[PDB]
Amino acid sequence: SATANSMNAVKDSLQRGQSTIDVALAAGDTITDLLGKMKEKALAASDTSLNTASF
Amino acid sequence: ALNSINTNSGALIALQNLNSTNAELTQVQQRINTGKKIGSAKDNGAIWATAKNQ
Amino acid sequence: KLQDSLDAGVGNLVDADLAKESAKLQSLQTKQQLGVQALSIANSSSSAILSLF
């Protein structure tokens, strides 16, 4: 019975881990969007027909 | 919890997804109204500035 | 999103699972009725001795 009761703490820990990963995935959506925009910036800047102000 | 009456985590996620759809709809309305995909410095600052100077 | 995950985490920590409590409630009500019946049986032990006198 004591062994069965201690599984409540195990469940609490696993749910805490799922919450931590949820916050990391929410940050990762922001980071992958930012990286796609930065790739578009570097791709546009590699063109040599731009003037200095656009670069 | 799994059968909770105090917390509806599924409703929170559904609210987030509805907010995403509403933000996309607001963006498309701005494009239809101005006729511009880059209508302000908030859309794309570098291309907006280049177009202003040109 | 962070506020929603903190609120869902509080719910994981403290909320009851009411579908499980419904089973516990029914079995406990039956147990209470049986306990009243068992106490009623124990109360009657003295009356058996009256027959001998």
Side-chain angles (χ1 to χ4, degrees), chain A:
Chain A
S1 267
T3 303
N5 291 335
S6 65
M7 308 288 183
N8 292 328
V10 180
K11 294 154 131 195
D12 270 341
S13 190
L14 300 161
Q15 298 179 294
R16 198 162 30 237
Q18 276 170 271
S19 293
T20 311
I21 294 176
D22 273 324
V23 176
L25 296 173
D29 278 334
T30 303
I31 280 146
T32 53
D33 288 344
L34 287 164
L35 286 167
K37 267 142 91 203
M38 293 154 83
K39 179 187 189 299
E40 283 164 77
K41 295 293 159 335
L43 190 52
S46 72
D47 188 346
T48 68
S49 77
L50 289 186
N51 56 67
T52 299
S54 302
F55 177 90

Side-chain angles (χ1 to χ4, degrees), chain A residues 12 15 19 23 26, chain C residues 1-2 5 12-13:
Chain A
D12 270 341
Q15 298 179 294
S19 293
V23 176
Chain C
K1 287 153 158 189
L2 175 57
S5 77
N12 294 323
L13 281 179

Side-chain angles (χ1 to χ4, degrees), chain B residues 1-7 9 12-13 16, chain C residues 1 4 7-8 11-12 15-19:
Chain B
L2 264 195
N3 296 274
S4 163
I5 63 179
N6 291 317
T7 299
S9 74
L12 297 177
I13 312 274
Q16 295 171 1
Chain C
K1 287 153 158 189
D4 292 335
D7 281 314
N12 294 323
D15 283 349
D17 176 351
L18 282 153

